Amino acid sequence: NILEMTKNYYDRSVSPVEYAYFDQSQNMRAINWNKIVDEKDLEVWNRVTQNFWLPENIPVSNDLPSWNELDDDWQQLITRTFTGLTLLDTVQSSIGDVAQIKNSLTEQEQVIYANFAFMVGVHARSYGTIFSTLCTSEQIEEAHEWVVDNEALQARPKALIPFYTADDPLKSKIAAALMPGFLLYGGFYLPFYLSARGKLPNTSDIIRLILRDKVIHNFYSGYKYQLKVAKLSPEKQAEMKQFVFDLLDKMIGLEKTYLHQLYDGFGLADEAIRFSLYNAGKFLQNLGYESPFTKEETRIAPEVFAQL
Amino acid sequence: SNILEMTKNYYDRSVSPVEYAYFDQSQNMRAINWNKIVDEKDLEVWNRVTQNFWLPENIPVSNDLPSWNELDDDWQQLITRTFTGLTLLDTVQSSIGDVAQIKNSLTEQEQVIYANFAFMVGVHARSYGTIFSTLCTSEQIEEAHEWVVDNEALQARPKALIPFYTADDPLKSKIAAALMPGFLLYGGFYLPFYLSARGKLPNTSDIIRLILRDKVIHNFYSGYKYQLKVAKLSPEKQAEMKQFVFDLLDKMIGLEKTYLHQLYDGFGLADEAIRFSLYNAGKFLQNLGYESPFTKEETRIAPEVFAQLSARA
Ligand SMILES: [Cl-]
Ligand SMILES: [Cl-]
Ligand SMILES: [Cl-]
Ligand SMILES: [Cl-]
Ligand SMILES: [Cu+]
Ligand SMILES: [Cu+]
């Protein structure tokens, strides 16, 4: 016989966030960082916290010479693109990441998504630091007006936010992965294109610090998606895969319209979209699915890939 | 004719994403503007809390092993229990409290500052794990978690605050958000400072001071935003909210006194810890813009303990 003198505290208690939103049948347990359910959580926690950075760390002032070499058209494109990325980071920091907390599989995940919310806030702030150093007050104001009135740009966050505010945690998680995994890469093409040609090298250092976080954010949300979806019936799993491909198809549609409008005048649209679709493929892979994208429609110039 | 607006500025015909998400989908969304800051206080607080970034790995807790090993099983148990209880409160604030504030922000930057608070209060909870990892046995750690779950006096306190976080009233939510860093953990913080005043667990007290360096600003900030918001109510509804703040604090003091008596009576620390608690209840009210109704005698702290609190870094 196995004598169980007492019942384990963990299995007869709930985390505070579960108690707040889902289940008040039992008392609350403090987070246990000494008895960790999933080692992956500790791995991710250690990496993202050790990778802490602020845009003040980077000497953007040194980009002044190369910035001054860029025509007014190019300076406007960069300010607009980056203000567009600032909107996506604002959406993700203030809504996306914090929405994931209550849907966590583990205690540590609740704290990791709090880190994500803060750090995606830092990404948004970093564009502010670049503009502060390089842009005129007029260029900054123009870009904000341009973002507010750009329907093609607005359609992308408008399509994802409903999944965050709705009560389907798997659809929320897919949206949460889609932001760092796909939606910003069309924008990140521009600084990598420029740095490959020797322009704005210090700005591209900030972009790489953002990417170092965003690749982990994509991996982590995709990993948690795969854990949860694996527990559903074959039929439910087939419905969720269909939803993922349907949502990505819509988002690719909306991104292609926005990038054409953004880049067609500069001759960068086709290149940016292939860069976008390459990352759409990696997004699908991080969700445990296969990329249906061709070699031809995902081709990236070596020097751009090198900046990546 | 003379005053007609032909160009409406972007800001006043757009909403932040969180406003769009939960309140109003009629207007397009504006990206955060860090180049035209509405409240300079937000930038000062942002710069301070980000510059004050720390991880518990930074403190050599293993240097506490000698002083820890001098404390008997009863004292080691009390410390593990007390800190697991503070871990619960930090978990509540990080996972519910701080993130609930984001959508009720007055400014764009405030939305990002509360994201920082959520994360750093997560770091506070994690730091107790680091202390336990170094000092405590598996048995002590698990014992403390069981004790927290089954301690009704402990549980009553967070159970009283969470409803304000999940409810609709953003002013009542903000009061709870100030009350957690301002008041509810200080009863527990007395213990490490009592010990380090006597040269016991000095490295643990450095972690407590790094936590407090954050908590003090969190209390100040939530208090500052509370004052800006209540100033926009009729004098009648101002008097009504003030009464609520005093009624809530009165209730929370009652629950805290019960918990601290149960926690400390056996160790003869209950009276001193409650005085320490009421001293910080005073600071909480002052940070909401009210006067402390507590006496010098009610809030007396031994100088050597106050030296540990007010010490820097
Ligand atoms: Cl992101
Ligand atoms: Cl994210
Ligand atoms: Cl707090
Ligand atoms: Cl807080
Ligand atoms: Cu992210
Ligand atoms: Cu706090």
Could you say which of A15, A27, A119 has the minimum Cβ distance to residue B155? A27
Q: Please report residues of B whose CB lies closer than 8 A to that of A119.
A: 119
What are the distances in angstroms from CA B269 to CA A205, A254, B155, B188, B279?
A: 54, 64, 21, 11, 16
Structure tokens at B124: 């506070």
The rounded distance, in Å, linking the Cα atoms of A270 and A256 is 9
Residue that has been written with the tokens 């009648």 in this structure = B236
Inter-residue contact B270 to B169 (CB < 8 Å): no
Is B59 in a helix, a strand, or coil? Answer: coil
Inter-residue contact A93 to B17 (CB < 8 Å): no
The rounded distance, in Å, linking the Cα atoms of A277 and A66 is 29
User: How far does the centroid of ligand 4 lie from the alpha carbon of residue A273, in Å?
Assistant: 42
Give the closest residue to B140 by CA, choosing from B55, B194, B82: B82
Sequence-separated contacts (24+) of A279-282 with Cβ below 8 Å: A279/A181, A279/A182, A279/A185, A280/A182, A280/A248, A280/A252, A282/A181, A282/A218
The rounded distance, in Å, linking the Cα atoms of A203 and A129 is 10
Is A43 in a helix, a strand, or coil? Answer: helix
Which DSSP string do the residues of B232-259 spell out, in sequence order?
TS-HHHHHHHHHHHHHHHHHHHHHHHHH
Q: Which method was it determined by?
A: X-ray
What are the distances in angstroms from CA B111 to CA A47, A112, B26, B214?
A: 25, 18, 21, 17
- How would you classify residue B117: left for phi > 0, otherwise alpha for psi between -120 and 50, otherwise beta? alpha
Domain B11-310, CATH: 1.10.620.20
Q: Which amino acid is at A3?
A: L
Tell me how far apart the terminal alpha carbons of chain B are, to the nearest angstrom.
Answer: 60
Judge: B88–A161 Cβ closer than 8 Å, yes or no: no
What's the angle, vertex CA B21, arms to CA B179 and CA A254, rounded to 5? 145
Is A250 in a helix, a strand, or coil? Answer: helix
Give the closest residue to A92 by CA, choosing from A150, A45, A160, A169: A160
Q: What is the resolution in angstroms? A: 2.1
Tell whether the torsion through CA atoms of A240, A246, A247 and A248 is positive or negative: positive
Give the closest residue to B86 by CA, choosing from B151, B37, B35, B28: B151
Residues ending a continuous segment of chain A before a break (C–N > 2.5 Å): none
E strand map for chain A: none
The rounded distance, in Å, linking the Cα atoms of A178 and A166 is 16
Q: Does B122 touch chain A (CB under 8 A)?
A: yes
The rounded distance, in Å, linking the Cα atoms of B91 and B94 is 5
Q: How many CB atoms lie within 10 A of CB A26?
A: 13
- How would you classify residue A113: left for phi > 0, otherwise alpha for psi between -120 and 50, otherwise beta? alpha
Q: Does B2 touch chain A (CB under 8 A)?
A: no
Domain boundaries, chain B: 11-310
What's the angle, vertex CA A104, arms to CA A154 and CA A285, rounded to 5? 65
Structure tokens at A81: 């693109």
Residues 6+ apart with CB under 8 A from B227: B288, B289
Which strand (E) or helix (H) includes residue A284? helix A269-286
What is Dmax (Cα atoms) for chain A? Answer: 81
By CA distance, what is B87's nearest residue in A? A30
Inter-residue contact B284 to B219 (CB < 8 Å): yes
For the CA of A176, the nearest ligand: 2
Please give all residues whose CB falls under 5 A of ion ligand 3, grouped by chain where several chains appear: B 93, 121, 180-181
Inter-residue contact B299 to B275 (CB < 8 Å): yes
Give the closest residue to B253 by CA, choosing from B284, B291, B217: B284
Inter-residue contact A64 to B159 (CB < 8 Å): no
Inter-residue contact B257 to B274 (CB < 8 Å): yes
Residues 6+ apart with CB under 8 A from A244: A174, A284, A287, A289
* DSSP classification of residue B137: -
Query: Cα distance from A302 to chain B (closest Cα, Å)?
Result: 32
Dihedral angle computed from the Cα positions of residues A73, A76, A78 and A79, in that order, rounded to the nearest 10 degrees: 170
Which DSSP string do the residues of A104-126 spell out, in sequence order?
-SSHHHHHHHHHHHHHHHHHHHH
For the CA of B114, the nearest ligand: 4
Dihedral angle computed from the Cα positions of residues A131, A135, A141 and A144, in that order, rounded to the nearest 10 degrees: -50
Give the closest residue to A149 by CA, choosing from B9, B296, B88, B132: B9
Q: Does A61 touch chain B (CB under 8 A)?
A: no
E strand map for chain B: none
φ/ψ of residue A30, rounded to 5: -60, 150
Inter-residue contact A91 to A160 (CB < 8 Å): yes
Task: Please list the residues that pair with B15 across neighbouring strands.
Answer: B29
Residues 6+ apart with CB under 8 A from A104: A15, A17, A110, A113, A224
φ/ψ of residue A166, rounded to 5: -75, 175
Q: How many CB atoms lie within 10 A of CB B69?
A: 9
What are the distances in angstroms from CA A231 to CA A11, A86, A237, A286, B92?
A: 19, 36, 9, 18, 28
Judge: A147–B31 Cβ closer than 8 Å, yes or no: yes
Inter-residue contact A288 to A222 (CB < 8 Å): yes
Q: At what angle do helices A234-263 and A269-286 cross, to 10 degrees?
A: 160
User: How far does the centroid of ligand 5 lie from the alpha carbon of residue B135, in Å?
Assistant: 35
Structure tokens at A196: 């490959």
Q: Which amino acid is at B222?
A: S
